[PDB]
Amino acid sequence: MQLNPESADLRALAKHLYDSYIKSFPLTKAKARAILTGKTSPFVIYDMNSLMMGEDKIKFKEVAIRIFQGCQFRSVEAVQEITEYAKSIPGFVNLDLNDQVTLLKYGVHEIIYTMLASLMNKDGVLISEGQGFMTREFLKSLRKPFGDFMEPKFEFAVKFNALELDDSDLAIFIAVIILSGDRPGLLNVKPIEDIQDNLLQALELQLKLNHPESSQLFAKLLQKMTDLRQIVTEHVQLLQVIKKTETDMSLHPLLQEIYKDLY
Ligand SMILES: CN(CCOc1ccc(C[C@@H]2SC(=O)NC2=O)cc1)c1ccccn1
Structure with missing residues (x-):
């Protein structure tokens, strides 16, 4: 590994993604883990009673459905943030x-x-x-x-979380996922693939500098990219069950369009 014009550009790219990441996402991992460890306090919902008290305290039908709908709305909101970051x-x-x-x-x-x-x-x-x-x-x-x-x-x-990535690691990782050339229905694959190769180089460089304690992190991460797809896969199958069993669930129409091509 050498300090040359190429690697200098990769560091600039990483810094840029990190700045956009901080601006695009309200709650970073850094702020999140601090809260999770008290180094900072959230209302804990652990039962039905605390659930009801909580709907009345935290500024955000049947309980299971309310919760599930809450996740959908958070999800739609997240799509907005992810889109702003992708740009x-x-x-x-x-x-x-x-x-x-x-x-x-x-x-x-x-x-x-x-x-x-x-x-x-x-x-x-x-x-x-x-x-x-x-x-x-x-x-x-x-x-x-x-x-x-x-x-x-x-x-x-x-x-x-055992991989112990931080926000500057995640900033690049999320960019790599977005620029996947193997998505169905792409018009121009090559320019997409060009950008990802660049992001992947930035990512490898980032992990080496940022995590001197592990030489396996990059390969473990590329492995996680596959676990993720399986989780989406497994999640849509469970969605069908919710449909073919319970008619009292109204799935948000934005998400509907996404899930259409995921079946
Ligand atoms: C458990 N939380 C935190 C958010 O946790 C989430 C879990 C799953 C999703 C994926 C959604 S849900 C679905 O079926 N399709 C999607 O995109 C999105 C968020 C909440 C959040 C608000 C109210 C109640 N609880």
Whole structure:
């Protein structure tokens, strides 16, 4: 490894993505872990009683449905943030507009679960920008099939968080996921692939500098890119079950359009 014009540009790219990341996302991993460890306080929701008291304290029908709808609305909101961030990725807006919409379409959920890991520990998940904390066991206490909803996410998060990536690692990682040339229905694959190769170089450089304690981190991360897709995959199958069983759930129409091409 050498300090040359190429690597200097890669460092500039990483710094740029990090700045955009900080501006695009309200709650960083750095601020999130501090809260999760008290170094800073959220209303903890751990049972039905604290759930009701909490809906009345934190500034945000049947309980399971309310919660599930809360996740949908948070999700739609996140799509907005992810989109704003994607536009700051060098080259992204110069792509054919349809490919931009396609990339985001097949990428937002992978990123959503990536970033949700930052807000999780083994006990639960931060909600409403850190105003609240909903416990893992409370989510499992929700009636079938909603009690199985979040558990794959927690399991992924616990493994992912062991990698101990920080926000400047995640800033590049999320860009790499977005610029996947293998999404269905892309018009111009090569320019997309060119940008990702560049992002992947920046990412490898970043991990080497930022994590001197591990030479396996880059390969472990590329492996996680696949776990993510499986989680989306597994999540849509569970969505069909919710449909072919319970008619009292109205799925947000924006998400509907995304899930159309995910079946
Ligand atoms: C558990 N939390 C935190 C958010 O946790 C999430 C879990 C899953 C998603 C994916 C959504 S849900 C769906 O089916 N399709 C999507 O895009 C998005 C967020 C909340 C948040 C608000 C109210 C109640 N609880």
